[PDB]
Structure formats: structure tokens, C-alpha cells
Short mmCIF file of all heavy atoms in Angstrom, two decimals:
data_model
loop_
_atom_site.label_atom_id
_atom_site.label_comp_id
_atom_site.label_asym_id
_atom_site.label_seq_id
_atom_site.Cartn_x
_atom_site.Cartn_y
_atom_site.Cartn_z
N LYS K 463 -8.61 -4.57 6.42
CA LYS K 463 -9.16 -3.99 7.55
C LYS K 463 -8.79 -4.77 8.90
O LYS K 463 -8.89 -4.23 9.95
CB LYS K 463 -10.74 -3.95 7.48
CG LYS K 463 -11.50 -3.19 8.49
CD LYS K 463 -12.95 -3.35 8.28
CE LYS K 463 -13.51 -2.42 7.17
NZ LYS K 463 -15.02 -2.56 7.24
N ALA K 464 -8.27 -5.97 8.68
CA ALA K 464 -7.69 -6.76 9.84
C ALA K 464 -6.37 -6.37 9.99
O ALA K 464 -5.80 -6.54 11.18
CB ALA K 464 -7.85 -8.21 9.55
N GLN K 465 -5.65 -5.81 8.97
CA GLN K 465 -4.21 -5.55 9.16
C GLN K 465 -3.91 -4.14 9.55
O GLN K 465 -2.91 -3.79 10.21
CB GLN K 465 -3.55 -5.86 7.86
CG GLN K 465 -2.01 -5.99 7.87
CD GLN K 465 -1.33 -4.75 7.48
OE1 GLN K 465 -1.86 -3.97 6.74
NE2 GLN K 465 -0.09 -4.56 8.05
N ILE K 466 -4.87 -3.20 9.17
CA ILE K 466 -4.81 -1.87 9.69
C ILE K 466 -5.17 -1.84 11.23
O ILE K 466 -4.71 -0.96 11.94
CB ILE K 466 -5.80 -1.02 8.86
CG1 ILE K 466 -5.30 -1.00 7.47
CG2 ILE K 466 -5.62 0.51 9.26
CD1 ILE K 466 -6.40 -0.64 6.51
N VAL K 467 -6.04 -2.83 11.62
CA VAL K 467 -6.15 -3.02 13.03
C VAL K 467 -4.88 -3.48 13.70
O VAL K 467 -4.45 -2.95 14.67
CB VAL K 467 -7.31 -4.01 13.29
CG1 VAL K 467 -7.26 -4.52 14.71
CG2 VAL K 467 -8.65 -3.34 13.08
N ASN K 468 -4.19 -4.31 13.07
CA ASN K 468 -2.98 -5.04 13.58
C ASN K 468 -1.85 -4.17 13.96
O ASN K 468 -1.03 -4.49 14.85
CB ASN K 468 -2.60 -6.18 12.71
CG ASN K 468 -1.80 -7.36 13.45
OD1 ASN K 468 -1.69 -7.30 14.60
ND2 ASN K 468 -1.36 -8.23 12.64
N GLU K 469 -1.62 -3.09 13.19
CA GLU K 469 -0.44 -2.23 13.61
C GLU K 469 -0.84 -0.95 14.26
O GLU K 469 -0.09 -0.06 14.36
CB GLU K 469 0.47 -1.89 12.39
CG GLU K 469 -0.12 -1.20 11.31
CD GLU K 469 -0.24 -2.12 10.10
OE1 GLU K 469 -0.13 -3.36 10.27
OE2 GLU K 469 -0.64 -1.60 9.02
N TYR K 470 -2.14 -0.83 14.72
CA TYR K 470 -2.56 0.32 15.50
C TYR K 470 -3.19 -0.11 16.76
O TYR K 470 -3.77 0.77 17.50
CB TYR K 470 -3.49 1.14 14.55
CG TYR K 470 -2.84 1.85 13.46
CD1 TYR K 470 -2.59 1.31 12.26
CD2 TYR K 470 -2.32 3.19 13.64
CE1 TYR K 470 -1.94 1.94 11.19
CE2 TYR K 470 -1.68 3.82 12.64
CZ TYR K 470 -1.49 3.23 11.40
OH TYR K 470 -0.87 3.87 10.39
N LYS K 471 -3.12 -1.44 17.06
CA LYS K 471 -3.81 -2.15 18.08
C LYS K 471 -3.94 -1.45 19.43
O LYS K 471 -5.13 -1.06 19.83
CB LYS K 471 -3.24 -3.54 18.39
CG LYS K 471 -3.28 -4.46 17.21
CD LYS K 471 -2.49 -5.71 17.44
CE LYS K 471 -3.26 -6.80 18.21
NZ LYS K 471 -4.40 -7.21 17.41
N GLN K 472 -2.86 -1.23 20.12
CA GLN K 472 -2.81 -0.72 21.51
C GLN K 472 -3.60 -1.61 22.41
O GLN K 472 -4.76 -1.29 22.61
CB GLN K 472 -3.18 0.67 21.59
CG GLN K 472 -2.39 1.59 20.78
CD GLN K 472 -2.63 3.10 21.03
OE1 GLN K 472 -3.63 3.42 21.71
NE2 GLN K 472 -1.78 3.87 20.52
N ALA K 473 -2.88 -2.67 22.98
CA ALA K 473 -3.44 -3.70 23.90
C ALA K 473 -4.51 -4.59 23.19
O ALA K 473 -5.76 -4.37 23.29
CB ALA K 473 -4.14 -3.08 25.20
N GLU K 474 -3.95 -5.67 22.60
CA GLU K 474 -4.41 -6.53 21.56
C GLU K 474 -5.91 -6.77 21.33
O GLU K 474 -6.26 -6.84 20.10
CB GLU K 474 -3.75 -7.86 21.67
CG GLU K 474 -3.99 -8.62 22.92
CD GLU K 474 -5.17 -9.53 22.89
OE1 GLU K 474 -5.63 -9.88 21.77
OE2 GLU K 474 -5.77 -9.84 23.99
N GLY K 475 -6.71 -6.85 22.28
CA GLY K 475 -8.12 -6.95 21.99
C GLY K 475 -8.84 -5.79 21.40
O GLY K 475 -9.93 -5.94 20.82
N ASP K 476 -8.14 -4.70 21.49
CA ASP K 476 -8.66 -3.40 20.99
C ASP K 476 -8.83 -3.33 19.47
O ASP K 476 -7.98 -3.85 18.69
CB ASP K 476 -7.60 -2.29 21.35
CG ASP K 476 -8.06 -0.89 21.05
OD1 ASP K 476 -9.18 -0.63 20.50
OD2 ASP K 476 -7.23 0.00 21.37
N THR K 477 -9.89 -2.88 19.06
CA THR K 477 -10.22 -2.40 17.74
C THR K 477 -10.90 -1.07 17.77
O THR K 477 -11.34 -0.62 16.69
CB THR K 477 -11.16 -3.44 16.90
OG1 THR K 477 -12.36 -3.50 17.65
CG2 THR K 477 -10.45 -4.72 16.72
N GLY K 478 -10.97 -0.32 18.90
CA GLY K 478 -11.92 0.71 18.97
C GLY K 478 -11.31 2.05 19.46
O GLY K 478 -12.01 3.08 19.50
N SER K 479 -10.00 2.07 19.74
CA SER K 479 -9.42 3.30 20.11
C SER K 479 -9.38 4.35 18.90
O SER K 479 -9.39 3.81 17.75
CB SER K 479 -7.95 3.04 20.49
OG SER K 479 -7.16 2.47 19.47
N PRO K 480 -9.28 5.66 19.15
CA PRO K 480 -9.23 6.56 18.12
C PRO K 480 -7.96 6.53 17.32
O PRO K 480 -7.82 7.20 16.32
CB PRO K 480 -9.34 7.98 18.84
CG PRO K 480 -8.86 7.70 20.16
CD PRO K 480 -9.39 6.33 20.48
N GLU K 481 -6.99 5.71 17.73
CA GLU K 481 -5.93 5.32 16.79
C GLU K 481 -6.37 4.40 15.71
O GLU K 481 -6.13 4.74 14.57
CB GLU K 481 -4.86 4.53 17.64
CG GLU K 481 -4.34 5.29 18.93
CD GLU K 481 -3.50 6.33 18.54
OE1 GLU K 481 -2.76 6.23 17.58
OE2 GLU K 481 -3.42 7.33 19.31
N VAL K 482 -7.07 3.33 16.01
CA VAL K 482 -7.47 2.30 15.05
C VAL K 482 -8.49 2.95 14.14
O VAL K 482 -8.45 2.71 12.87
CB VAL K 482 -7.99 1.08 15.73
CG1 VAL K 482 -8.32 0.03 14.72
CG2 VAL K 482 -6.86 0.47 16.62
N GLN K 483 -9.53 3.67 14.65
CA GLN K 483 -10.52 4.20 13.93
C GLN K 483 -10.04 5.13 12.89
O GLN K 483 -10.55 5.14 11.73
CB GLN K 483 -11.61 4.80 14.80
CG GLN K 483 -12.25 3.84 15.80
CD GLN K 483 -13.33 4.49 16.55
OE1 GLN K 483 -13.78 5.61 16.18
NE2 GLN K 483 -13.75 3.83 17.57
N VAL K 484 -9.10 6.07 13.32
CA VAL K 484 -8.57 7.10 12.34
C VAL K 484 -7.75 6.36 11.36
O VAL K 484 -7.78 6.83 10.18
CB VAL K 484 -7.77 8.16 13.13
CG1 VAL K 484 -6.96 9.12 12.20
CG2 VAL K 484 -8.71 9.03 13.81
N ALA K 485 -7.16 5.30 11.59
CA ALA K 485 -6.33 4.54 10.67
C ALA K 485 -7.22 3.76 9.73
O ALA K 485 -6.87 3.55 8.53
CB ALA K 485 -5.35 3.69 11.34
N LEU K 486 -8.35 3.19 10.19
CA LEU K 486 -9.25 2.52 9.38
C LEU K 486 -10.02 3.52 8.44
O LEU K 486 -10.45 3.10 7.35
CB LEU K 486 -10.31 1.74 10.20
CG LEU K 486 -9.77 0.58 10.97
CD1 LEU K 486 -10.85 0.06 11.77
CD2 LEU K 486 -9.50 -0.51 9.95
N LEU K 487 -10.17 4.71 8.93
CA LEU K 487 -10.82 5.71 8.00
C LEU K 487 -9.91 6.30 7.03
O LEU K 487 -10.26 6.43 5.85
CB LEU K 487 -11.39 6.93 8.94
CG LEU K 487 -12.62 6.62 9.69
CD1 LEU K 487 -12.71 7.82 10.66
CD2 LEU K 487 -13.77 6.57 8.83
N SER K 488 -8.61 6.59 7.47
CA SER K 488 -7.66 7.16 6.52
C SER K 488 -7.27 6.30 5.41
O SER K 488 -7.05 6.76 4.26
CB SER K 488 -6.34 7.50 7.28
OG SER K 488 -6.70 8.45 8.32
N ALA K 489 -7.29 4.98 5.66
CA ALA K 489 -7.00 4.07 4.64
C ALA K 489 -8.13 3.97 3.54
O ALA K 489 -7.90 3.85 2.40
CB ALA K 489 -6.83 2.63 5.13
#
């Protein structure tokens, strides 16, 4: 869950964009 954050980041402090959340869900 730290590494699915890491290639979907979009401005490094981010963990909350719908990029990261859809990627954390899809995995």
C-alpha cells in the first residue's frame, strides 16, 4: 500500500487524489 501510493503520487505529499485511491482499490 506504500508502493501503490508511490507510482500514482502526483505531487509527493499526496495520498488522496482519485488516481491513488482507484489504484489502492484496484489492487
Side-chain angles (χ1 to χ4, degrees):
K463 193 184 279 185
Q465 195 265 330
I466 303 160
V467 164
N468 201 7
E469 60 254 10
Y470 288 88
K471 293 173 86 64
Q472 298 191 353
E474 58 89 20
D476 186 359
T477 59
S479 62
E481 305 286 330
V482 180
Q483 301 185 8
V484 170
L486 290 172
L487 286 167
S488 299

